[PDB]
Design an enzyme around this catalytic site. Structure first.
Site, PDB file in Angstrom:
ATOM      1  N   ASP A   1      20.590   2.804   6.171  1.00  0.00           N
ATOM      2  CA  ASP A   1      21.698   3.733   5.998  1.00  0.00           C
ATOM      3  C   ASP A   1      22.452   3.910   7.316  1.00  0.00           C
ATOM      4  OD1 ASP A   1      23.413   5.714   5.239  1.00  0.00           O
ATOM      5  OD2 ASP A   1      21.897   7.309   5.219  1.00  0.00           O
TER       6      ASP A   1
ATOM      7  N   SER B   1      40.994   1.823   9.732  1.00  0.00           N
ATOM      8  CA  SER B   1      41.604   0.712   9.029  1.00  0.00           C
ATOM      9  C   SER B   1      43.115   0.771   9.206  1.00  0.00           C
ATOM     10  CB  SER B   1      41.221   0.770   7.547  1.00  0.00           C
ATOM     11  OG  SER B   1      41.928  -0.166   6.766  1.00  0.00           O
TER      12      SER B   1
END
EC number: 3.4.23.22
Length: 330
Positions: free
Chosen positions: A35, A199
């Site tokens: 994770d 992004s």
């Protein structure tokens, strides 16, 4: 040193991925959910409330000659899906794919919430976010990666998740046979303890690319792709009959649909998520309503590049002094 371990979907939907991990002496092998959105290595154990264990393999520290109680240390964690776990702490030898750390904090669960009990295939979590998020008190502990780092050939790990197929976590090296083209690296902020990056935009299907900054985290422990409501609406608008359902808890679409791809930007590079990756199947057995793999982050408070996005790429988690993230197509 290096390590290399195969990671395998837990079910036919890629709801999560498990990776075998050796703990203790003799080895006890548990299948952990790696994770990159948390920083605790915790396991089902001989200390876990019996009624909260349903099929998981447990770690038994009393059977490990290298286990030592970390006296006075406790831990308690709550995840973004409302699940939780807590307990006490041992140090022990932990190996992943042939890479060994001695003195790793292994957090033994005394209690786990229902979501964990119900997932018989997940024996615990191995956190790979920054150690500043680790919950052990009063002495915060380091992640497996942080502990391994100085011994690694290169201070990196890579995630190469499969679509309805096994994939690989590598530690200490970049497998240049595992991706196509070049790797594009992008800046990371560690201010919130995550692999947080920005992004450069998105496209829906064959549509034009929209240049827009989307801050989010690379999180292998989250199944879906959670993005701003504007972006998600633009995606689902291209699917006839798709709608957001408050009763279901997100966007659903007719199971008869063919889903468009979704592209996200990494610098000037582009990663394309095929439409099939965005299909999470019937909302309930036999239903003709299917659950979408792109969902709104509104009310989470952060955008999350979870497995839907990450499995479309070869992803480098570069833990050098200035951390960065790399993405390549594959």
């Amino acid at each position: 040193s290096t390590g290399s371990a195969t990671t395998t979907p837990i079910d036919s939907l890629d709801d999560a991925y498990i990776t075998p991990v050796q703990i203790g002496t003799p080895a006890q092998t548990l299948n952990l959910d790696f994770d990159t959105g948390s920083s605790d290595l915790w396991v089902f154990s001989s200390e876990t409330t019996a009624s909260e264990v349903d099929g998981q393999t447990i770690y038994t520290p009393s059977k490990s000659t290298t286990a030592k109680l970390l006296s006075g240390a406790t831990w308690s964690i709550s995840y973004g899906d409302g699940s939780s776990s807590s307990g006490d702490v041992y140090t022990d030898t932990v190996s992943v794919g042939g890479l060994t750390v001695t003195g790793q904090a292994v957090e033994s669960a005394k209690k786990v919430s229902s979501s964990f009990t119900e997932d018989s295939t997940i024996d615990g979590l191995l956190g790979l976010a920054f150690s500043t998020l680790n919950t052990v008190s009063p002495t915060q502990q380091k992640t497996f990666f942080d502990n391994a780092k100085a011994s690694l050939d290169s201070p990196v790990f890579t995630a190469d998740l499969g679509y309805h197929a096994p994939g690989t976590y590598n530690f200490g090296f970049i497998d240049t046979t595992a991706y196509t083209g070049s790797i594009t690296y992008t800046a990371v902020s560690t201010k919130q303890g995550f692999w947080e990056w920005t992004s450069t935009g998105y496209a829906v299907g064959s549509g034009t690319f929209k240049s827009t900054s989307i801050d989010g985290i690379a999180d292998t422990g989250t199944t879906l792709l959670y993005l701003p409501a504007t972006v998600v609406s633009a995606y689902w608008a291209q699917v006839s009959g798709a709608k957001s359902s408050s009763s279901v808890g997100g966007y659903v679409f007719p199971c008869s649909a063919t889903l468009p791809s979704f592209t996200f930007g990494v610098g000037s590079a582009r990663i394309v998520i095929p439409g099939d990756y965005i299909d999470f199947g019937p909302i309930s057995t036999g239903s003709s309503s299917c659950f979408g793999g792109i969902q709104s982050s509104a009310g989470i408070g952060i955008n999350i590049f979870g497995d839907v996005a990450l499995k479309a790429a070869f992803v480098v988690f570069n833990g050098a002094t200035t951390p960065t993230l790399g993405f390549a197509s594959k």
